Design a protein around this nucleic acid. Sequence first.
RNA 1: UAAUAGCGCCGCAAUUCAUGCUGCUUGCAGCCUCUGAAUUUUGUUAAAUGAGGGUUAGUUUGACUGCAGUCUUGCUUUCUGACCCUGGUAGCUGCUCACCCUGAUGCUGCUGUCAAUAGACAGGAUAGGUGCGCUCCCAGCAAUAAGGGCGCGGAUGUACUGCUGUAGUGGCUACUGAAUCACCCCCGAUCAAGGGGGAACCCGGGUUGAAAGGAGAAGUCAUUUAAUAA
Lengths: 601, 87
Amino acid sequence: SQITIQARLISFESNRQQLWKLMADLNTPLINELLCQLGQHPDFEKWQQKGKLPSTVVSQLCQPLKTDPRFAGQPSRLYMSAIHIVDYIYKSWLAIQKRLQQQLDGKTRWLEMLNSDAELVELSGDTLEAIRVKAAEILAIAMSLSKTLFDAYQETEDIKSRSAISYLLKNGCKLTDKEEDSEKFAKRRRQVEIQIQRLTEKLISRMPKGRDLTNAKWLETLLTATTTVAEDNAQAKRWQDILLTRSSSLPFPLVFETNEDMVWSKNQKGRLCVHFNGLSDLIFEVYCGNRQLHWFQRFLEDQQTKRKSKNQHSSGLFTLRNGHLVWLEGEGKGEPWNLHHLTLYCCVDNRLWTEEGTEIVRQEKADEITKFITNMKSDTQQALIQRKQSTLTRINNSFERPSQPLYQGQSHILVGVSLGLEKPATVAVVDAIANKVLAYRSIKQLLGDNYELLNRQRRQQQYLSHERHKAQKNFSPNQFGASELGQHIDRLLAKAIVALARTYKAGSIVLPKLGDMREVVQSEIQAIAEQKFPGYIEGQQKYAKQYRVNVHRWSYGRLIQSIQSKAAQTGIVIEEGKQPIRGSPHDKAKELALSAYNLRL
Amino acid sequence: SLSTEATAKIVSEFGRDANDTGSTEVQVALLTAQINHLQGHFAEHKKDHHSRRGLLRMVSQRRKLLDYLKRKDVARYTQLIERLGLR
RNA sequence: UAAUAGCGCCGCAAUUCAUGCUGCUUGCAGCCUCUGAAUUUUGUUAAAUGAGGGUUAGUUUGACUGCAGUCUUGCUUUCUGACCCUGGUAGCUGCUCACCCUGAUGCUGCUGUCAAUAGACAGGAUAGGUGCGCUCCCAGCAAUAAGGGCGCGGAUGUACUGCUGUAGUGGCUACUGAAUCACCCCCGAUCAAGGGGGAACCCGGGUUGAAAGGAGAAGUCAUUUAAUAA
């Protein structure tokens, strides 16, 4: 449901320079607190096993750095901004590593289990029919089927008769009469081996790196490498890998996770202003287009409404949720605080705009806070509970807000969206009780006046990829791409799909479980290419470059998110299902929506 | 790259005889002269990513010539390092 | 002179139905006048797409209250228009070349005039090949993909752009030339700022092109450029 809106902040030099000095000084403990966990911390491998960072460890590394002679000059809210960012960096990175470990194990089981029909006969000492009969018994026992079959293979080895469970699993949890081609099986088993290899090469990932603005390592390495002689090829390359590294020009943003830690006001000139907790001397002026101003007026109205009411209304329902203050990169020459541009990005929960939507968040938080209190049931724990009980009483006192009746769709009408390489979207609207398609759309309809933009995107990707190649050979800085055009097209389709869902009173939009299509294609094309260029690895990589590149450029996750966002701002439910391997783009969309309807029970 | 006079000056001072156009001591002295002038420019114009390619080649060539001379004759190697102020 | 072919787009001609068009049988009959899918074909002052590099806190996509009245902000992006340029000297620096053959995701390709030296001058995005483009093709060059041939000195314990060299082509910094616009004209401000004077049209007021928005941090893989290594 959340959105991010933005404004540039304007203020005389002295204020934009003082804030830069604090952020160039804050950017440094953002690096020292990563090193205190990157190498220093002894427990680190226990966290990699669990997949989660302990909720207090970054604060317990930061608390003694608050008096460090290098870091002591900063407000209490700038240290909380440091702790926030470093908590989120590792809390992300450990959760990336854990899912890769789980996938590597979850396929290492399968590479042991995947056997040819002849190997099942040898391993059982029995006929492939005896295996078909035992596979039929195993389905009869089972009737989460796939999970149950993996459990029944883990447990219950049963004199190697679990070989018949592997016969079900390779056949997609079904009986098969046909006996398979050993060349097709060799390609299949090779795809699994390639996926195991690539997962290990990925799982061996780099630790998080901080934004070192100082150039000190680079300058020290330059004067070392030019005046001294390396003792090894490894040392001479270690200096090369440092000297090639581009250094960062921007400090990490400030994060203000409490909405009240931004204070709003109106300037004499009638313009809006803002100030931050701990920087309450530095008034900043808001500059934003009238297409976004209504939120910045709402910020000040939410604040005035609470202050006019003796704090009896809660910022648990303030339209602003959190702010990220960032320096966007400028152009040309000048001091960093005169060259770059302070920009304030406000997280906003869009459903807090209206009274009917605010009531949803009131019920959502009142249920979550009630449960939290009953789960707690300490010293400072007594004050945490008083804060939660006080939020739970105050949240019932309403802000005066715009009214708009909630959208309601028909529980039987669904929009199916089918994504692919040639057709980025294609739509079928199904009445699932009639089994009747109400409408279909192809791309030429689904963004209408804008259909020239798909042809533009394909021209621009091809044109600009060649210009980047020509530019790199000359060391030109000019490096451009179609990324913002692809982002616009994915947003045009997201608006049109939801406008169509509203038009037909659909209860939900259905999006495919595409999953990791990029890695799957990369292993399929490699298992095949190894059969056509054996030993010539450069020829294996050249085999289907344009197909592999087009799959790595395929924006399916960004279109899926663009539709999710616009659907949830409108109130339409999102649902999911398996996308058919065969059929036209329309048939894919039709069967996808009907499948998601069948999954209701 | 060096002026004509500057090359002639460097080869006449590191060359063991009037015949040395390119013994290992002359070749390392010309790479050393280049690298010093290039570090004074590349530390100032930090954006000049075409000159970092030139420096990293030119340092790596010097190291190969020094490793060859070290095994071939340690006395020539020791005297060359002294005369070029390297460590 | 040449560019025949291949590949990707753009419509145009058809054929087959529907997500469309007439009926009531709310699912059939019927056709292609539209709006759309699929295949095939085509390059006919057909039609439609059409990447030389740059320029505005530009306009419209906006909020609230019963389609009328108030308030309005200049953020981040995608197009369509319009206008300007096809650059100047002052240093620093990378790469490339004894000389040959093959010729690469190699460079170059417009109009007019003078020279017919390789370059100036004046026009200009129509700018080699086709309806429009390419890593494809044609023409010239090719040292700056790569491989091979091979001359004379130094070095010769595995290193050897290391020699045969003043030009070619880039990179970067400082100053500078034009546009600094959204119907034109003029005076200004760019962490801010607007103001003044006209042309045309509609019925003293408007009009004088439209669109999209979830952002930060970290990690990874795809080709593709450079360096290094065996």
